[PDB]
């Protein structure tokens, strides 16, 4: 037969917190001619807080059970970022700048 | 036969929090000519708070059960970002800038 | 036979919170000539708060049950962003800027 | 037969915290001509806090159970970032700069 | 038969913390012509705090169970960052700079 008996009496549990913040952040990236960002993170992380908890309760004596838990990820991505040419560019993302000049003269 | 018995008496549980914030953020990316962002994150993360909880209760003695939990992801994406040419560009995303100039002269 | 017995008495549960905010945010991306964003996130994440809860209760002694839980995602996307040419562009998304000029002279 | 008996009485559990912050952050990357970022992190990390908790309870005497937990990730990504040429670029993301000039003269 | 008996009485557990911060951070990388970052970290780390907790409870006397826990990662990524040429670039991400000049003269 078998028996799985769990008794819980007079439990006072409190202040269980799980926080994730500013994860995988790309900030303040200025490019004078161009910015090329290929942003492909694969995230299977865990931020877990457990307090007075239990897992799965399985009672299977003498069983021919087949339990399969599968998780398959296939990545065959094909990403192409292409720019032919850039010239004669003034980029001022800063503040309070004076007399910013770019000159290009061609003679043939 | 078997038995799965769970008794819970006089439980005071409180302040269970799970927070996710500013995840995968791309901020402040100025490009003088161009910005090319391919933004393909794959997210299977967990932010979990458990307090006085339990898992699945399974009572299957002597069973020939087949339990399959499958999760398949296939990625064959084909992304192309293309720009032929850029020239003669003034970009001022900043504040309070004076006398920002770009000159291009061609003589043939 | 078997038995799954659960007793819950005098439970005071409170303040169970699950928050997701500002996730996958793209902000402040100025481009002088162009901005090309391919925004394809795949999100299967979990932000979960459990307090005094339980999972599924299964009572299947001696059963030949077949239980399949499948989740299939196929991605064969074909995205193309193309721009032929750009020139002679003044872009001022900033504030309080003075004398921003772009000049292009061609002589053949 | 067998028996799995768990007794929990008069448990006061509190202040269980799990925090993840500013993980995998790329900040302040200015490029004079170009910035090329290929951002593909694979994250299976754990930030876990356990307090008065237990794992899975399995009661399977004399069983021919087959339990498979699989997790397969395949990465065959093909990412190409290409730029043909850059010249004659002034990039001032700083503040309070004066007399920033770039000159290019060509004579044939 | 067998028996797994666990008694827990009068447990006061508190202040269980697990923190991860500023992990894998790339900051302040200015490039005069270009910045090329291939950012592919593989993270399977653990930041764990355990307080008054236990592991999995398995009661399987005389069982022919097959328990497989597999975790396979395959990386065949092909990343190419290519730039043909750069010249005549002024990059001033600093503050309060005066008289920054770049001159290029060509005569054939």
Swiss-Prot record, chains A, B, C, D, E:
State what changing residue 49 to F does. In PIDB; markedly reduced ability of tau to promote microtubule assembly
Which residue ranges contain the repeat Tau/MAP? 4-34, 35-65, 66-97
Q: Where is the protein localized?
A: Cytoplasm, Cytosol; Cell membrane; Cytoplasm, Cytoskeleton; Cell projection, Axon
Q: List the disulfide bonds.
A: 20-51
Residues modified as N6-acetyllysine are 10, 19, 27, 40, 46, 50, 60, 72, 76, 98
Tissue localization of expression is: Expressed in neurons. Isoform PNS-tau is expressed in the peripheral nervous system while the others are expressed in the central nervous system.
Q: Positions modified as N6,N6-dimethyllysine? A: 40
Q: How is it modified after translation?
A: Phosphorylation at serine and threonine residues in S-P or T-P motifs by proline-directed protein kinases (PDPK1, CDK1, CDK5, GSK3, MAPK) (only 2-3 sites per protein in interphase, seven-fold increase in mitosis, and in the form associated with paired helical filaments (PHF-tau)), and at serine residues in K-X-G-S motifs by MAP/microtubule affinity-regulating kinase (MARK1, MARK2, MARK3 or MARK4), causing detachment from microtubules, and their disassembly. Phosphorylation decreases with age. Polyubiquitinated. Requires functional TRAF6 and may provoke SQSTM1-dependent degradation by the proteasome. PHF-tau can be modified by three different forms of polyubiquitination. 'Lys-48'-linked polyubiquitination is the major form, 'Lys-6'-linked and 'Lys-11'-linked polyubiquitination also occur.
* Chain positions with Deamidated asparagine modification: 8
Q: Where is this region: Microtubule-binding domain?
A: 1-97
Query: Which residues does the record list as glycosylated?
Result: 9-10, 76, 82, 98
List site positions: Not glycated.
3, 19, 23, 27, 40, 46, 50, 60, 69, 72, 99, 104
Q: Which disease is it linked to?
A: In Alzheimer disease, the neuronal cytoskeleton in the brain is progressively disrupted and replaced by tangles of paired helical filaments (PHF) and straight filaments, mainly composed of hyperphosphorylated forms of TAU (PHF-TAU or AD P-TAU). O-GlcNAcylation is greatly reduced in Alzheimer disease brain cerebral cortex leading to an increase in TAU/MAPT phosphorylations.
Function description: Promotes microtubule assembly and stability, and might be involved in the establishment and maintenance of neuronal polarity. The C-terminus binds axonal microtubules while the N-terminus binds neural plasma membrane components, suggesting that tau functions as a linker protein between both. Axonal polarity is predetermined by TAU/MAPT localization (in the neuronal cell) in the domain of the cell body defined by the centrosome. The short isoforms allow plasticity of the cytoskeleton whereas the longer isoforms may preferentially play a role in its stabilization.
Q: How does it assemble?
A: Interacts with MARK1, MARK2, MARK3 and MARK4. Interacts with PSMC2 through SQSTM1. Interacts with SQSTM1 when polyubiquitinated. Interacts with FKBP4. Binds to CSNK1D. Interacts with SGK1. Interacts with PIN1. Interacts with LRRK2. Interacts with LRP1, leading to endocytosis; this interaction is reduced in the presence of LRPAP1/RAP.
Protein name as it appears in the record: Microtubule-associated protein tau
Q: Which organism is it from?
A: Homo sapiens (Human)
Placed within the complete protein, the shown segment runs 589 to 696 of 758
């Amino acid at each position: 037969g078998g028996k799985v008996q769990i008794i819980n009496k007079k439990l006072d549990l409190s202040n269980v917190q799980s926080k994730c913040g500013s994860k995988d952040n790309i900030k303040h990236v200025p490019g004078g001619g161009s910015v090329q960002i290929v942003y492909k993170p694969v995230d299977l992380s865990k931020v877990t807080s457990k307090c007075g908890s239990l897992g799965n309760i399985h009672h299977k004596p003498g069983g021919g059970q087949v339990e399969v838990k599968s998780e398959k990820l296939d990545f065959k991505d094909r990403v192409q970022s292409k720019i032919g040419s850039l010239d004669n560019i003034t980029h001022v993302p800063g503040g309070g700048n004076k007399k910013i000049e770019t000159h290009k003269l061609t003679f043939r």
